[PDB]
Subunit: 349 residues, 2 copies
Amino acid sequence: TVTLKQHERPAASRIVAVGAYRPANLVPNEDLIGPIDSSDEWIRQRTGIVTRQRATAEETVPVMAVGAAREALERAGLQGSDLDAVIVSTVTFPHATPSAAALVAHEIGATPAPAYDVSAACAGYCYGVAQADALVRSGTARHVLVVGVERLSDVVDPTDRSISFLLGDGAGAVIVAASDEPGISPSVWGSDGERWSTISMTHSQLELRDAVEHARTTGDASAITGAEGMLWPTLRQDGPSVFRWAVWSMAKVAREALDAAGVEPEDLAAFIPHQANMRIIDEFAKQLKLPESVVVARDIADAGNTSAASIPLAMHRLLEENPELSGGLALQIGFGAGLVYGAQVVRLP
Amino acid sequence: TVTLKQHERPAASRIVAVGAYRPANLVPNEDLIGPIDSSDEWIRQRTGIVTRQRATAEETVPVMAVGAAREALERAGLQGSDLDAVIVSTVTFPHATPSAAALVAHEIGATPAPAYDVSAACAGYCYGVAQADALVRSGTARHVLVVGVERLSDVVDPTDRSISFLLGDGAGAVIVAASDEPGISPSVWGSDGERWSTISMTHSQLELRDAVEHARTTGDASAITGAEGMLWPTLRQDGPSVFRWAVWSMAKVAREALDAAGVEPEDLAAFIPHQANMRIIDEFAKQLKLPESVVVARDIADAGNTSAASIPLAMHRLLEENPELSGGLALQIGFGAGLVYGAQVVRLP
């Protein structure tokens, strides 16, 4: 009987660099308040957001992912061809198939590395890291690129007061590499599909299909011309439910991640939650009983909520503003539509 | 100072069961030839297809995925709560977010297992297996559900001669578990994003957005009525390039998988390529110098090309027809839009 061969496995893994792409357009509250009939001060008070990154038409998911990817590559002292896998976490690339990852892999010179997109909403980067970590520690890959990237502005309804004005665009990239010393703690990640509808689109793409093609065939374009709300599906959320879950449920996940890591809040150099909402971030930090020395990421004030991009973008900003955090421990925890969540303690690059 | 804890790792991984969902509506060539001005004969000679599976409106991606998954759990002697991760490979779930995996995980009682959709086209199941293998051998998961599932009928154009009549609907699933004996060989997987447009949608979802919202907000519904051709994006391909690529390139990837497995064609119980086209299957078989004793999967003749679902469906069928293949080595290889590909040698459950 034949025994199958197997890859050898390194001791551990580690994030060896972080890269960022931020659209230059920082939209202020005032530009958005009209159609949702609110105000600069209300938005600032409810969400702590002042400006959000808004991408132009040319700044597509692949464009943004590539820029972030290239910065990470340069900071790691690597090139595209050194990558053994490319994971792109996004829900806004406007093609069912093929993936954005395959374009990214090609553009950055990673061919022929395997390349795929992942769907895990705002937890997407942390899901990416769990996967990358698994790929490295099983000896499947020595260097894995993970990109959290979104052009959320493509799926907001300007009249929506549940989520539209919170969302921004951008890309954040990380490179996970084989390592001698543990740099990524065991992932704590999960789902609760019972609550699939808590953050979701207004309706299925098939409704859009059925309408447009019925209009096209029959020549009757009512139902479209007479439509009061957008037919293009857009993002929506039960705001209050998100808050209760985001804070009081995720706090248990974070403590679990710390516990599995073998780490106390005192050992952290930084706390980098997904940038969902300043109110969520604050209440979260309080619940974790962090000492004053732990730096809390609050990129959301200038970037808005960039979903999968949010954590690596905030990590990137943390390191620029405090270079001495490099080598320190950071708790990262993302959470979004699904519902899904993921967390790790990581040694910062 | 502080050393992060790490998970213990299993010696190996293996597939422990396979489940299937096949829509009952088998559609013969005759029902399709009209709009493409073709024939039964032409279709059989070009593709080897006699009928393809076609889902009803009720047979959504989650519904099919759930049926396949439940069969796999039952055959493995497991319940949903035994699963530590759920991976769904699909490109036809009609929601940008949240994922189909989140719903599937809930229906089967796998909550709170992490759950995500992967985008890797027809190589989707093979990508999923490589991921599942990494998750297990890294000790991140001990039981991983992988489901390739598509309702391709949602994204075909009945007038399209390049791919429409080739495609069928369905779900196949496997459970990958921690193992003492190697049951999954090192994956050979990759991408060539330079040929991203080789198999692609007719156009971006954004063009659909711009057309419908414009019509909705101006009342001018031209461009929708009197649009020749579908506004709803549909799948298409450059057939001769896909074929050329399969024979020039994928045959070689398949040999590499044997090499990396430490396995000869004489050692195979079965060959289970992605069911792209009967002629490609047959060319592969010849090109790989398979002995007569190796059973070749040809589910395509009855199911059509079910993309990500094709390998596990075909596997399910081989085991139903040749129960004694259980425990034998099977070479599986998927390849599709991206371009992307994956292959492994696997021990049949």
